[PDB]
Amino acid sequence: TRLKIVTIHQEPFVYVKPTMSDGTCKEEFTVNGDPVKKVICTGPNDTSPGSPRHTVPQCCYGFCIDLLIKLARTMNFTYEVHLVADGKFGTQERVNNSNKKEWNGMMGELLSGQADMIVAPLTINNERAQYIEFSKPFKYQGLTILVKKGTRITGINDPRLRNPSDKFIYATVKQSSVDIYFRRQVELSTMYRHMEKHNYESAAEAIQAVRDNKLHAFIWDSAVLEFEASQKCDLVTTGELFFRSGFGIGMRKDSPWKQNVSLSILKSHENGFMEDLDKTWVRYQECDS
Ligand SMILES: O=c1[nH]c2ccccc2n2c(S)nnc12
Question: In which residues is glycine bound?
Answer without folding.
Answer: 121, 123, 128, 177, 221
